[PDB]
Design a binder for this molecule. Structure first.
Ligand code: HEM
Length: 439
């Protein structure tokens, strides 16, 4: 049962900052956007990632997420350049390819009248995408189970359990790290033999991965640090989007009028096409659907910090050493800052107006965090999810399956369901329809 739920009712009663105590230990729970902005942006230098490092160190090492200080600064500067406009445009092709692979599975299911458990399918889709995008590996988890795949999920579950088995985890970590080593070696040879001058918009068309960019850049790093950086991006970009897609499709089942409006846009703008970078700005309603899904189901629902200096939060002075949970769930669903906060309403932000972000929503909306530690994959993931949503909604009607297990939420790094999202899937286009390509 999700720990952030009781925090919502406590926020309603006790306000935007309170101290949650468990005997001799306590946590400050922050649900006020002004206080959130102070911690995440205005006075970020007074904060570390705190217990987040303790939870994640065993798998991410000194990757970007749990890092602080000079290690953080140096690696952020090295990695962000890889996610340039040319790279993101190339990844859109990957997003379409992988989404189409999922569509093929859904199509087979639909023809047989089989119900599908979409959370697991989305988890596989997003794993396949992130492995290829980050380090040029094809997990093909949409198609098969492998030892490497099982290792990733094992390490995942263990990370969240900290949010026999110890040996299983150790073995899984070894297998992933050994796989990353092989990939790094292969990429090194490829860079050695290639004939491309490195620059700000560098990418090898045959291997557009972030790993390849890092190696071609002349990245001054240890093998340990590189593996940790890769592992970190793998975790960061996998279950996050898996949950975004899962919750988006859950939400679509709750509002047929939204589905109708989404179908109208997809049919009109892309039809059967793989989306391109140009379609990203035209898929306005699809983007709003995603925006609204992230508002209702943030990933993660809580951001973690610890004070390393004195500060003032709201009216309250604090010392160093305070463990702080910023409740993104509360910020996103705050009755004071959102009209009909529990309603799934993609048009709560004007369709043709600017896309919502932490700046224009003044820290009441933080889908990708904020300030210096904001997600580096915000554009990547926003586009990834728009592609997957659009291609699936073009091809299929989805409904909650009769007798499906109830949809409920769990604790964890991301908001998982308790038992999956079991849906019926039916085709919207005919097998013998000619592919339709709108321009
Ligand atoms: C829907 C998908 C995603 C969501 C909702 C998401 C969300 C977030 C959030 C909220 C943070 C800030 C955490 C904090 O401040 O403590 C973050 C950090 C980060 N994310 Fe994402 N993310 C997504 C996908 C990705 C992808 C695709 C990548 C890489 C390609 C990525 C890489 C990272 C990294 C490296 C950080 C740490 C940045 C730093 O500390 O310098 N994430 N993410």
């Amino acid at each position: 049962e999700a720990f952030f739920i009781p925090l919502y009712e406590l926020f309603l009663t006790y306000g935007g900052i309170f101290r949650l105590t468990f005997g001799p230990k306590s946590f400050l729970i922050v649900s006020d956007p002004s206080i959130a902005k102070h911690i995440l942006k205005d006075n970020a230098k007074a904060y570390s990632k705190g217990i987040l490092a303790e939870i994640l160190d065993f798998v991410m090492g000194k990757g970007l997420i749990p890092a602080d200080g000079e290690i953080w600064r140096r690696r952020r500067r090295a990695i962000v350049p890889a996610l340039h406009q040319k790279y993101v445009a190339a990844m859109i092709s990957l997003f379409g390819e992988a989404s189409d692979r999922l569509c093929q599975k859904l199509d087979a299911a639909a023809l047989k009248g089989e119900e599908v458990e979409m959370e697991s399918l989305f988890s596989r889709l997003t794993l396949d995408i992130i492995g290829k995008a980050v380090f040029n590996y094809d997990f093909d988890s949409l198609t098969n189970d492998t030892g490497v795949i099982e290792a990733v999920y094992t390490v995942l579950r263990e990370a969240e359990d900290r949010s026999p088995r110890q040996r299983k985890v150790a073995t899984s970590l070894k297998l992933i790290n050994d796989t990353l080593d092989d990939l790094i070696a292969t990429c090194k040879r490829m860079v050695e033999e290639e004939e491309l001058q490195f620059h700000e918009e560098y990418m090898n068309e045959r291997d557009p991965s972030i790993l390849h960019f890092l190696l071609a850049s002349g990245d001054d790093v240890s093998s340990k640090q590189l593996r940790d950086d890769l592992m970190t991006m793998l975790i960061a970009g996998h279950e996050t989007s898996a949950a975004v897609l899962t919750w988006t499709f859950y939400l679509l089942t709750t509002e047929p009028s939204v589905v109708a409006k989404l179908q109208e846009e997809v049919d009109s703008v892309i039809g059967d096409r793989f989306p391109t970078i140009q379609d990203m700005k035209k898929l306005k309603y699809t983007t709003r659907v995603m925006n609204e899904s992230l508002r209702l189901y943030p990933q993660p629902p809580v951001l973690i910090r610890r004070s390393i200096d004195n500060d003032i939060l709201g009216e309250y002075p604090i010392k160093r050493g305070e463990d702080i949970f910023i409740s993104v769930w509360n910020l996103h669903r705050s009755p004071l800052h959102w009209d009909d906060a529990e309603k799934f309403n993609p048009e709560r932000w004007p369709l043709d107006g600017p896309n919502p972000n932490e700046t224009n929503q003044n820290f009441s909306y933080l889908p990708f965090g904020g300030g210096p530690r904001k997600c580096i994959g915000d554009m990547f993931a926003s586009f990834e999810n728009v592609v997957a949503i659009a291609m699936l909604i073009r091809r299929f009607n989805f409904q909650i399956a009769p007798g499906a297990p109830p949809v409920k939420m769990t604790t964890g790094a991301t908001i998982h369901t308790t038992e999956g999202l079991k849906l019926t899937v039916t085709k919207r286009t005919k097998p013998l329809d000619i592919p339709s390509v709108p321009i």
